[PDB]
């Protein structure tokens, strides 16, 4: 790999803030916050709120109610 | 920042919240009341914990691309079913009953002198 021409690349850990799913992968970005990891090593930690586990599509269950039928709206509206 | 929109820094917290899509001034006051944060402080002066509490309230709320998709879905629903309102949306004319002989520039667009 050529020297001094590639963007600075470093290993980094990512944690899903919502669920805490963890994985170690390289990145160009660096995080001031660093964490430990199995094999007795520490790496910068880039916290993320949304990941595969958190994202609804990967789960297969949808957070949205999928809206209402108009007649049902009317049913609740006029008590019918 | 909060909902993916970098709200102004020096502005007061209520106004900076209003800069978020889907949130008006009344809604901003309500969410700040729930979070207990005073309305006068600037967002820069807000602590990290206050910001996180505000984030939880906003996430509980429905805003940004979610709200935009919902409104577009409603408008698309009208247009597809072919309602009078749908045709109004399609042709870019006032939908709420206004007269189109004059005015109507907001929907129509810039005047064409032809």
């Amino acid at each position: 790999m050529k020297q001094d021409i590639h963007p600075n690349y470093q290993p980094v850990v990512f944690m899903d803030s919502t669920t805490g799913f963890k994985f170690l992968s390289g990145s160009t970005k660096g995080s001031s916050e660093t964490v430990e990891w199995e094999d007795g090593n520490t790496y910068p930690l880039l916290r993320v709120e949304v990941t595969s586990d958190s994202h609804p599509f990967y789960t297969g269950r949808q957070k949205f109610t999928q809206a209402d039928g108009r007649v049902d709206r009317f049913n609740k509206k006029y008590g019918l | 920042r909060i909902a993916g929109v970098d709200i102004p820094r020096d502005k007061r917290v209520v106004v900076s919240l209003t800069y978020i899509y889907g949130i008006g001034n009344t809604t901003a006051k309500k969410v700040l009341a729930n979070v207990g944060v005073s309305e006068d402080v600037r967002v820069r002066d807000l602590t990290n914990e206050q910001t996180d509490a505000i984030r939880a309230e906003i996430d509980k709320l429905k805003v940004e691309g979610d709200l935009r998709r919902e409104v577009n879905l409603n408008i698309k629903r009208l247009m597809e079913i072919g309602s009078y309102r749908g045709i109004r949306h399609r042709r870019g004319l006032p939908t709420r009953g206004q007269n189109t002989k004059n005015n109507a520039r907001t929907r129509k667009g810039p005047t064409k002198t032809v």
Partner: protein
Amino acid sequence: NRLKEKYIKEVTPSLVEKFNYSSVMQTPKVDKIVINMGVGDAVSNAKNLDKAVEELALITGQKPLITKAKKSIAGFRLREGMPIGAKVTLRGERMYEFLDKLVTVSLPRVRDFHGVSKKAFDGRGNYTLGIKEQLIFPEVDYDLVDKVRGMDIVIVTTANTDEESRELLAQLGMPFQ
């Protein structure tokens, strides 16, 4: 190493069993990943290409090759050899790391994400994912980008059939529609 470990451990035995390969050598694998960013705006301002190149390098971790128009086309105000579009090639460990990050982080951050296509196969077991916009990769920082842009990520595998390629990609994690 996570995705490489996942492949060699889970995916390889699974594909072997599913497709009844006489020898392990037949196991399809991701040969390479080529990410291409087509910048026609370079003609108007080369700085657009420079920013796109900077974004791609940050996203990928490698300096991109600045492709050049093989032919001069008047339709696009294009002269042969103009540096329009860039690409990066990733193999082995860097390939695995970038693919894992794409599966986990970048794809969810896509606007209104309902998964990836299930027909973008050349017919030989090689796939391509057409990213509409950047800012989905965490390295972008969502602020440096003055102009939003997309890209095309071509995953080249040794799979002989679209079926085998689909199985490998799904097992590696691919939200097909």
